[PDB]
Symmetry: C3
Subunit: 130 residues, 3 copies
Amino acid sequence: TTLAIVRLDPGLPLPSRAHDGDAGVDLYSAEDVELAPGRRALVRTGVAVAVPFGMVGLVHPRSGLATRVGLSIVNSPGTIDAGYRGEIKVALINLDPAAPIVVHRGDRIAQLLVQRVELVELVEVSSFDE
Amino acid sequence: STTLAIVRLDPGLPLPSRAHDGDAGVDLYSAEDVELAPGRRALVRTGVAVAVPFGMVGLVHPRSGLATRVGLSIVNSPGTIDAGYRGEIKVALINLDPAAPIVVHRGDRIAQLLVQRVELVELVEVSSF
Amino acid sequence: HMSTTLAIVRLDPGLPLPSRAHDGDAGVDLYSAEDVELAPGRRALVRTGVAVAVPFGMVGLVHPRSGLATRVGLSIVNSPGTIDAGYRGEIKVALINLDPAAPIVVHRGDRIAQLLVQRVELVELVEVSSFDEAGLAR
Ligand SMILES: O=c1ccn([C@H]2C[C@H](O)[C@@H](COP(=O)(O)OP(=O)(O)OP(=O)(O)O)O2)c(=O)[nH]1
Ligand SMILES: O=c1ccn([C@H]2C[C@H](O)[C@@H](COP(=O)(O)OP(=O)(O)OP(=O)(O)O)O2)c(=O)[nH]1
Ligand SMILES: O=c1ccn([C@H]2C[C@H](O)[C@@H](COP(=O)(O)OP(=O)(O)OP(=O)(O)O)O2)c(=O)[nH]1
């Protein structure tokens, strides 16, 4: 499958899959931001994508940063719908009780996966079969 | 074209729906009013039960707007709905804001439900990699 | 459906092999290899005593256990944890106590997470100057 991607911010590298078989491509921060303990920010990644119909984009936290500094994503896994053509934004939060997180423009702050989704049709029933 | 059987345990709420074609999830409603003080959690009823087909999994995800705007999260995200489960879907909401309480009223949309295939892998112990 | 195998190594042989508790359950439970106490707001990187070989074309996903999320506010900082197809190391779980007041005590042999395996689309990114110009312009 291909994923069309617009670099809204041309100063950042194109997201790339570091190893073959890696699930995600890393997303970059377009901005310098400091998160005090317990505080959050909505951070621009400088990209937009066109997730194919029948698929979903998923924004996951990076594991390294998660343990080392307690960086997380409030709405994790972030859900990118097929019809979304805006900028991908990452709702970062510092879950460390005492130390700030310094995020720089150019840092890898999340990863983007693409998977198939079942666009189920909901059928209301009165009860389930037992 | 897969169908997802659903029961409104709470008949007074709208049926969950896909806002646009292609959207991965359907929004779940709260059946209840809840106030979450900063850092507190609550297990909130949605008024629905579903029948995830065998070979698939139900996934409860946070909504992006409330996440940023008020710091609303889900403790066990992504909430895993197994194919054998036929009880009420409940959402473990938590307030990750430091100072501002979160108000949820009955009828608010508090989460989204995705359905995916899952690989029901058979584990095989090996000596080494 | 009929799936494949997942090769698994018990780096810690005193723990039980993860298993699927019921036939169509999405996940298998992972165990803690360690005793650890998490004070309110504190996290730890907890060893599970296992390594896996997620098939190429797939991803392993580490999800929190719902039960403990509710009873005690246990969560996973990088949820869902992403286990890449090429990883052969030990699976570790970034546990965090989201309760404001009660410590969480984790014992060796306790179930601390679940592991799912799914297909993933190993997309090839194609840069386009704009969606409008690409014919892709909710
Ligand atoms: O909950 C997890 C998540 C990941 N991992 C392992 C598997 C994976 O392939 C690797 C890296 O994960 P990720 O890409 O999320 O973190 P990173 O900070 O980007 O580290 P790396 O440079 O190793 O990718 O670490 C775990 O043991 N447990
Ligand atoms: O981490 C994320 C998650 C979402 N989005 C964008 C993509 C997506 O299609 C849209 C809506 O996300 P979601 O459906 O989670 O939020 P909502 O509060 O339910 O908004 P909506 O009313 O637009 O569905 O916002 C992001 O940029 N980053
Ligand atoms: O956000 C969620 C997550 C799970 N469940 C339901 C679905 C699922 O199949 C069941 C899990 O029950 P169980 O008591 O087996 O949980 P556990 O064994 O403590 O952990 P897990 O749910 O992670 O298997 O509860 C929900 O209603 N909402």
